[PDB]
Symmetry: C2
Subunit: 227 residues, 2 copies
């Protein structure tokens, strides 16, 4: 924002005005949504960012030849505020984007949540994405209990899940409510000392999510393809 | 039972004692169960009956060559009680039998209920047979709400069943309760006269069952195979 050179050329001014107005806040917001599990908004912003980083790629290629031939652009000679590494590292956000329909984007987002060990969000997305996949097959509808198409899609998913992938739901639930909840059944005593009930190990979750969960999701998804 | 002539040879006494003790009551009971919709009990019998009619087939083939060469056998000359047509007509019950597991037997029984125009029994069997199919895939269980395997199998069938094939359930219900029921919504007046609330669609029942329903069942069964 305050990055203004005292004097510089017309080509220098055009490229610096381009860089000066790159929507870094959209990149930050994208990460905030992915982190806090606003999976729908995460995937929606995906196209805006493809354009933000494509504009940054070209601003950066220009800034690169500028610094490769630094002898010509001596106006940056004393400028501190402009950092290539800050912008080039921002281009890594490209690794979080995919092309396709919002269902295909959410599908990739699920993989991203497994890669980063974000277990809680990966499970909820694995649980609810098949419901959204089912709704597409039946022509579409809102994620509301008032919607008939959803009402039954959910019932099929929930029942097929409780039938074969009983564990998926058990984990998702445990992680959603956390240790201090009916899913963990800890015991509060007279002294205020709590003694945990259930004990699901770090490796039970790590292994299930990072190994079985993908395959289990894919097995659910082509099952509902027939529907 | 009262069939017992005064004169008889060793070959004719052999066959007449065989015919005299053919379990016709099992054939009658088989029909009683098929008629009243005790589909499970009827399917278990189909093996017993296969043997009853296989014994009757050879009894009859013997009785046939006996009557084809009637002049060698003039002992039956005055006997009234033995009549071929009664036994040969009983052999038609073979058309009601099939080979395989009880699930494959019930599957054929469904077709039989469509052939004879017994709509209600065909619908209930079409709606419940996919649950027993599902229960086989998950290792087996009792048709009780206490059984977990059933509880969800039913939920999948019912939901896939209320999502697509909406009509099947509507018909099955209507036919189960009949005209005097909440599914038909008739109106009883002050005087004592009832005025129906829906139209008895003789032809959509006939047409749905005898045309669409076998396809609607195969499509369901193909869907739950993946489960």
């Amino acid at each position: 924002s305050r990055l203004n050179p005292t004097i510089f050329e017309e080509e220098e001014k055009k490229v610096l005005t381009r860089v000066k107005g790159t929507d870094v806040n959209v990149v930050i917001n994208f990460l905030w949504n992915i982190r806090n599990g606003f999976t729908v908004n995460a995937v929606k912003s995906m196209n805006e960012l493809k354009n933000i980083i494509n504009q940054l790629e070209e601003d950066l290629e220009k800034l690169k030849s500028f610094y490769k031939n630094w002898e010509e652009h001596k106006n940056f000679q004393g400028e501190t505020l402009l950092v290539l590494s800050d912008l080039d590292s921002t281009l890594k956000v490209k690794d979080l984007l995919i092309e396709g329909n919002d269902l295909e984007k959410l599908n990739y987002l699920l993989d991203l949540y497994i890669k980063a060990s974000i277990y809680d969000k990966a499970l909820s997305l694995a649980r609810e994405l098949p419901v959204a996949i089912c709704l597409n097959k039946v022509g579409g509808g809102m994620f509301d209990d008032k919607n008939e198409k959803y009402k039954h899609c959910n019932e099929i998913v929930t029942s097929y899940l409780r039938l074969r992938y009983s564990g998926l739901m058990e984990f998702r639930n445990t992680l959603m409510h956390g240790g201090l909840s009916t899913d963990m059944k800890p015991n509060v005593d007279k002294d205020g000392n709590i003694t945990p009930g259930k004990i699901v190990t770090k490796n039970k979750i790590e292994d299930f999510v990072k190994r079985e969960l993908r395959n289990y999701f894919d097995k659910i998804v082509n099952f509902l393809s027939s529907a």
